[PDB]
């Protein structure tokens, strides 16, 4: 029977991206379901080995998936991961693209902490989006995980904390829908950009869609600039109209950060926790779903 690593039976495809396909697997030792990422060895720019190292440096972190095996097999590099629950995009669609304010706030709190943890390990994520957060399983069903370090990179030296240098004329990295203004302008990504992207994710949860979503275009690169100019021509206060001011204050604060500034994560969490209390919400992990 078809196995990777002698040990993990390969199952149906469950996802695909620019850095490999994701498949279900079954560990024959325990019957544990797993996720299997495959990357073609004859690819023009090897990456899965680097993502696996990144995952290994993050292990033990709250909401970081465990990597079970990493190796090479035939025409493929292989990374076997712990299987988690549905993504936040899956759950958003399941709830008809409607999240309550309570659910948005509970998630924001954990998501800010996930990003802060990655930053504390000297890496920036660069692909913050609803598909890249997954809920846990069983008694970790209230825990938000962060996945996909395929675009991640170090922003600071591990020993001196010297920040990577500023630069312009970069190509767009990440996803057009959730990228920061700085990214659209070709500026090197840093810690602020992960947090700005999360700000767009949260307003996307509030609204059901973002104003620069679904713009008709022709070439794939005229679409990107139509997104970029719609993103820039939409003031944060128009984007957040109809919702508590904390969401615009969050987005304004991330746009105000300098390239190498350390974000005040505790401040950002406290904006939402304070709003959480004014709504009279209880922290019971009762999500909409």
């Amino acid at each position: 029977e078809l196995r990777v690593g002698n040990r993990y039976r390969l199952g149906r495809k469950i996802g695909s991206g620019s850095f490999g396909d994701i498949y279900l697997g079954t560990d024959i030792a325990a019957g544990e379901e797993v996720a299997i990422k495959l990357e073609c060895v004859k690819t023009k720019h090897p990456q899965l080995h680097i993502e696996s190292k990144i995952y290994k440096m993050m292990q033990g972190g709250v909401g970081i998936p465990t990597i079970r095996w990493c190796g090479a097999e035939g025409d493929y590099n292989v990374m076997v991961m712990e299987l988690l629950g549905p993504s936040l995009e899956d759950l958003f669609n399941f709830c008809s693209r409607k999240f309550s304010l309570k659910t948005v706030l509970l998630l924001a709190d954990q998501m800010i902490s996930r990003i802060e943890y990655i930053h504390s390990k000297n890496f920036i994520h660069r692909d913050v989006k609803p598909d890249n957060f997954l809920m846990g399983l069983g008694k970790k069903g209230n825990l938000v995980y962060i996945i996909d370090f395929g675009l991640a990179k170090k922003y600071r030296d591990a020993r001196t904390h010297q920040h990577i240098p500023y630069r312009e004329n970069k190509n767009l990295t990440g996803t057009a829908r959730y990228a920061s203004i700085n990214t659209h302008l070709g500026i090197e990504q840093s810690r602020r950009d992960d947090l700005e992207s999360l700000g767009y994710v949260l307003m996307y949860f509030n609204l059901g869609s973002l104003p620069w979503q679904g713009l008709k275009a022709a070439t794939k690169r005229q679409k990107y600039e139509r997104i970029s100019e719609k993103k820039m021509s939409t003031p944060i206060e128009v984007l957040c109209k109809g919702y508590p001011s904390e969401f615009a204050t969050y987005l304004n604060f991330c746009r105000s950060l300098r390239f190498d500034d350390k974000p005040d994560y505790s401040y950002l969490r406290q904006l939402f926790r304070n709003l959480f209390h004014r709504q009279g919400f209880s922290y019971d992990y009762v999500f909409d779903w």
Binding site: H45, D131, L151, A176, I227
Partner: peptide
Amino acid sequence: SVASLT
């Protein structure tokens, strides 16, 4: 528009 880019 949600495709991951290098």
